[PDB]
Amino acid sequence: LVAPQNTFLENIVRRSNDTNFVLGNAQIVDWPIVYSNDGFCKLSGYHRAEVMQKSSACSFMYGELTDKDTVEKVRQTFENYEMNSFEILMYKKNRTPVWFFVKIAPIRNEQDKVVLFLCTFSDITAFKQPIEDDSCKGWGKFARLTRALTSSRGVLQQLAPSVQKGENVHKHSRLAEVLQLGSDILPQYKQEAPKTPPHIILHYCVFKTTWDWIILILTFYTAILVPYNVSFKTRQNNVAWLVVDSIVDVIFLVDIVLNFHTTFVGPAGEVISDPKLIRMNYLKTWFVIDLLSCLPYDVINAFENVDEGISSLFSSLKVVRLLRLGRVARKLDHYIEYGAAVLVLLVCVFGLAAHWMACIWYSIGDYEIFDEDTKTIRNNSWLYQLALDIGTPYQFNKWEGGPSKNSVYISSLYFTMTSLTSVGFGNIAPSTDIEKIFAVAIMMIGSLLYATIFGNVTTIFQQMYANTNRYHEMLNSVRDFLKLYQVPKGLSERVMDYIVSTWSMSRGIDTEKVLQICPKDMRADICVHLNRKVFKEHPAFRLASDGCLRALAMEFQTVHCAPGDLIYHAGESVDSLCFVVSGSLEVIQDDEVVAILGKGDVFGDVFWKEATLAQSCANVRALTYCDLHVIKRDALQKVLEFYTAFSHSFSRNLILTYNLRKRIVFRKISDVKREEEERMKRLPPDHPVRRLFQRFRQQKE
Amino acid sequence: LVAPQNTFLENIVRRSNDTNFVLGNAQIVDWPIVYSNDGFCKLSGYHRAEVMQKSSACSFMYGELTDKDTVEKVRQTFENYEMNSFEILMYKKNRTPVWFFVKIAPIRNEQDKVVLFLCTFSDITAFKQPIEDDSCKGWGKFARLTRALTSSRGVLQQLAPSVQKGENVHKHSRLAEVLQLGSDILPQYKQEAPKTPPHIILHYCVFKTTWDWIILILTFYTAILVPYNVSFKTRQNNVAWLVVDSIVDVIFLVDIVLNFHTTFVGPAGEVISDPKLIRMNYLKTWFVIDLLSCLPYDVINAFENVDEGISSLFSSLKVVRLLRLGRVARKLDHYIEYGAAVLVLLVCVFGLAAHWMACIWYSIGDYEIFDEDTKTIRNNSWLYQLALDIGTPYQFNKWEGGPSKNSVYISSLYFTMTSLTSVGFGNIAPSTDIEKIFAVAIMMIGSLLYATIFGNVTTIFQQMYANTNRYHEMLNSVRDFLKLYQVPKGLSERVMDYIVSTWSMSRGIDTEKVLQICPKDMRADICVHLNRKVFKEHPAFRLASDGCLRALAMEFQTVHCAPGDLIYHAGESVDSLCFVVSGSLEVIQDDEVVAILGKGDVFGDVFWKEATLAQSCANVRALTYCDLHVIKRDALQKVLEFYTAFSHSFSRNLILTYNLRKRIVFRKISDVKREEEERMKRLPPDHPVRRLFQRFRQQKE
């Protein structure tokens, strides 16, 4: 976990080595000071807050003895961007003059430009011509001046009292640290990556990734071949296996050496790349184990024809080559997390265990069958029962070969395989004490490993089907509720269809939760992108600043309306401007069509001007699958009143397509025709309606 | 579950035994009264509220007959801290004089000091010289005085009327209870631990813990050896087993005895340590069972050579030694909770059941094989089939020994093992009716136990992988959302990287939930520790009291910002002071660097002075992995206005590094150079811009 980060301050403070620095801007008139340091504030007496936003020429610290020639030099060097180091008397808060040495070194940028200046400071007050302005005593002023040069008097020039005429080297010693700032100028105020130290290969590189698989394949091959070779009485009539063994040893030794020069993930951190402790970590962790596993003890003895005693006993222990599984033990944490890879690992270890146990079974049978000097055939042993069953039984003149190795290995593997899988055909079965003990052990191991496999498979299935079961349960609950509360089909069908359709599109994701997971800036940018369709299109938003745009994108809400669904029923309070972005809607007023809205149109009421709620005067109905972007009145009013400059143009530029509060008046053709027909066929006691007419006239007046 | 608690009040009220006491302070002038009692208030007529904060010399209760000599005695004893008991006439609310006896006994402290006084009270009005001030009648006053001495007239001195001249012992009887207060003075007002009663060993001690494992090992050994010994016709040719059996019996009897003197966890409480019922609990729970299991019935009969009839029948029942599993039945609740220990327990019980069933199988075979007086060999039995298969078949001259016990036991164990593991090689198989019935039983038991093992393994795997599956599901949901809503890669990469990185560091812990779980004081202290980095460092907080410090630590929030993430975009409302504690940030104004912030710097606006919101005038961008401590404006204003004294120094001491509301003005070198170049190359109808200039001048005026 590493990101491209600007390492300006860290590198500069590490490389300063008990010095002081002030950063200045390079592209502004008079070069305002952009940063100061604790050492600078301590030496000058000026606080960082009161020294910020000051000219980098340090004119704020000038006085009587400052030289116009020095002013010219600093100005010309600043305007020329050249490395230089001056010494000029400077003035602190109390105006008391003290000698001073300076050095200026601007730093470039990755885009081939100069952005930041850097002026360093040094004190030579105790090692220059003594100058005083107003002090109680000359020696007192000298002591005061000397008390400020602790950095110079320290280990930087601690050998000065022990020697004489050291001024010829004190300046060089002081400037040596300052000249190192070019090393910290290498990032050049840019997103410099964490470059690795030389002769170290990152462990997430392509080469390392493709090497790990080869090392795993080779360790698998050696784990398979070692017990077979050690137990099945195989001969060395085939030389090429020795050559392949030698190449295997070479590859493993090369990997062992390469494990020194490779970064590793630190348990107490994230990434460690320090060669002074990487090698120590590897050596203390696994180097001894891998080296002892990676040496062919018998190879040298066989090549040199050593004595058949202690040397042969040492050589015969090549079973120790099996512990090469340290590589797999290391690697298994890379892919142990996957649900579906643990099953493959378990199947592979099942097969490997089957091979090992079959090899042990042959070893037991071969140790058992003969009776050594007793010359008894021991017809009890399975290795004789199989020789009788399969054909070519034993005979003597020396004893015959009986079964061949090719069939013997397959038979042993079949027996171990049936024992592990717990099928148990039993045509080959243990018969003596040692075989029976081994049988008890093998049944126990097989039962446990089978339990592990079954557990893993059940976990995979359950974690696969949990989500579908949850969805089905929710649907069943909704159906049961709707059946219980006697809701008719005309609404039940719509509810079930809406639930099914919304699940089909939204899948198992919650937009609110996804938004809340991310931080604030990510939330802002995601919302701005989601409402880009309205923002870029509608002309009323073309004069929006970043802050108001984000504050509006936070509140804008997207609503999907299916055809047939009403949005604003007649008489409902209207409190939300809504921009149509897709599909089309219509407005119905007194069971008639009075306007039709399409893409890029907004309908509602002018909230910031009306400042009151009104009843909706017409119904709005969906026609096609539309997308709406509604915004509540309160949030819009708050944002608009916060951004007065934005409002002064928003009010002028936003014109509503249809205003819901206002309603139109009109007459019907059928109504006027009926009125004319009635008039074609055309009160003294009408006191109540006379009073009604008088009241209506008074109200209209 | 016991904690170090001060048992002052509980012990003193238990030991008072129907008396009264008033606690007084020992390190304050005039010794204000720190606590009173119901008995004291009832007898004196003064309420606790109106008697608190009064001199411990009881001068508030003095009157005419109080003696200056008694005042001198009480003062000198109080200043000398000495045990003493006086009697002096005291005055109640109605001023009526009544005789009184007092005793003062200060109590020390664990730090070798005196902190609390203790003055006891007693009434001797009815047993002293009668004194009256103003009463209706002498006998009436006598009755009134006698009516107040019920505590003395009770069982404390109930034998006084039955005897004469009892005043010589009444004082001793009254003082005996008061003198016991030294026992309650033992805690000395300190965190006294709940010391155990003598001759009782706590059951969570090291000795008990290390003894439990030994008793479990020995019960396992006896459970393994008992059925083998009882069934396999083993002989006593090896004496040492009898000695080991004797030592086993001694150890178990010692454990049985030791179970009397050991505290046990009470089901209806937490810890019970009362010896008068601990022994009863053990006896009613398991003592009879353990004692009957822990006696070698046959040992005494064998040693004494008892008759081979009823005594031998009694002795032959040593199978009853098997019920020693009561210890494991008790103990299994200690380690039943662990998920990974139930598997080991199940494997052990599997092995033990296998051994038991193999022993039963041998018993059945040996009972079956021979036909008793019929002399029939019964070639059907497995114990003859095995003797034919393995070699050395039976022969007669008496009948031959056939197979040896060493092979017979292994064969029986192998048969039971295959039956239980459900492998079923079948080279040894039941052949008669009894064997077939036992086979049906053994298959059923094996199937059920195998089911239990598989269930346990599946539960372990699922509970191991649930968390990883949940994390993967959440990541997949976020990826699916981002794919659905067409967000570009430039934002998708950042979102996915943020989620992965935040999970990597935070693991599966929610800071808000962890905070909410704990109580209020723990929450406050945890928050104070979490913000210690700012609190101890920033000088503006060096004058903070406990209440304001906690009220600020409750609202301070920690924010981790990755490099490249913006915090305050230009034009956004600024409402939060934020202290930088690690890394470094920069402020960008008009695409330029104007200030740089490091460790121990704060940027925002002076809320308590401005009392209004302002638009941010510059962008702030992260450079390195930084930690921010932001605080909202409302909470800070509320706390500051609550703590006026704290505010009067906070405003003076807090100086902002960069003020976002304030914005600096400047010119660019390129801009001024271009302006000069344009000027080097250098209106009557300009009425609109003349009007613009006039309006600008009017606005500036």
Author numbering:
A (entry chain A), B (entry chain D): 10 to 406, 412 to 696, 704 to 722
Can you list sentences taken from the study reporting this PDB entry?
Here, we present a cryo-electron microscopy (cryo-EM) analysis of the mammalian Eag voltage-dependent K+ (Kv) channel in lipid membrane vesicles with a voltage generated across the membrane using K+ ion gradients in the presence of valinomycin. The Eag K+ channel was chosen for study because its pore is gated by both membrane voltage and intracellular Ca2+ through separate molecular mechanisms. Four voltage sensors inside the membrane regulate the gate in response to membrane voltage, while four calmodulin subunits in the cytoplasm regulate the gate by closing it in the presence of Ca2+ (18). Voltage-dependent ion channels contain structural domains called voltage sensors that control pore opening by membrane voltage.
The up map (C4 symmetric) comes from the class with better-defined voltage sensor density and had an overall resolution of 3.9 Å. The up map has well-defined density in the TM and enabled building of an essentially complete model including side chains in the voltage-sensor domain (VSD). The up structure of Eag in lipid bilayers is very similar to the depolarized structure in detergent micelles, with a slight rotation and translation of the CTD relative to the TM. The VSD retains the configuration observed in detergent micelles. The S4 is a 310 helix from V328 to L334 and an α helix on either side of this segment. Of the six positive charged residues in the S4 helix, K1 (K327), R2 (R330), and R3 (R333) are positioned at the level of the extracellular membrane leaflet. The fourth positive charge, R4 (R336), occupies the gating-charge transfer center inside the membrane. This region of the voltage sensor is formed by F261 from S2, which caps the top of the gating-charge transfer center, and by D264 from S2 and D299 from S3, which interact with the side chain of R4. Farther toward the cytoplasm, R5 (R339) is proximal to W295 and D299 in S3, and K6 (K340) is near D221 and W222 in S1. The pore of the up conformation is tightly closed, as expected of Eag in the presence of Ca2+ and calmodulin.
